[PDB]
Amino acid sequence: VFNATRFASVYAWNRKRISNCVADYSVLYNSASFSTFKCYGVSPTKLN
Amino acid sequence: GAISSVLNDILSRLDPPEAEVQIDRLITGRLQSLQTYVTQQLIRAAEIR
């Protein structure tokens, strides 16, 4: 999803379902790569 | 008025400052419900006396 070479269009966007796996959100939050990271539903530090 | 009626749900989701806004509606709503119960007890207590 995040590291894909080319995302789909915003007109028609690719919806990827993530289930039955281990989600580590610290690599993405702590490491500085993406400029905009914000969580409306929950807190960014409580994601894990 | 809060998103959810559980305290642990709002505390683990919204930020501390944002949760306080939702917690305000929870406490304000519970206070009105708690005072309404105490007010009825005092009235019912008078009828018993």
Side-chain angles (χ1 to χ4, degrees):
Chain A
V1 292
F2 296 154
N3 291 338
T5 304
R6 299 289 182 270
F7 300 167
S9 64
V10 64
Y11 175 78
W13 60 89
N14 187 340
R15 180 181 294 177
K16 179 61 174 172
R17 181 176 181 171
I18 296 170
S19 178
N20 191 30
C21 54
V22 175
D24 185 3
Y25 295 132
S26 64
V27 175
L28 298 171
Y29 176 77
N30 290 336
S31 179
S33 178
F34 298 155
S35 63
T36 300
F37 178 82
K38 186 179 180 180
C39 292
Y40 298 133
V42 294
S43 178
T45 60
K46 294 177 179 178
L47 297 173
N48 290 337
Chain B
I3 295 170
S4 63
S5 63
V6 176
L7 296 175
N8 291 337
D9 291 344
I10 295 171
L11 296 175
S12 296
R13 294 174 297 181
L14 295 175
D15 291 344
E18 294 178 351
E20 294 178 351
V21 176
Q22 295 300 321
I23 294 171
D24 181 67
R25 294 182 182 175
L26 295 174
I27 296 171
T28 299
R30 294 182 182 175
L31 295 175
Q32 294 177 336
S33 63
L34 178 63
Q35 294 178 336
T36 299
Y37 176 79
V38 176
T39 299
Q40 294 178 336
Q41 294 300 321
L42 296 175
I43 295 171
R44 297 295 181 190
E47 183 178 2
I48 302 301
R49 296 177 64 185

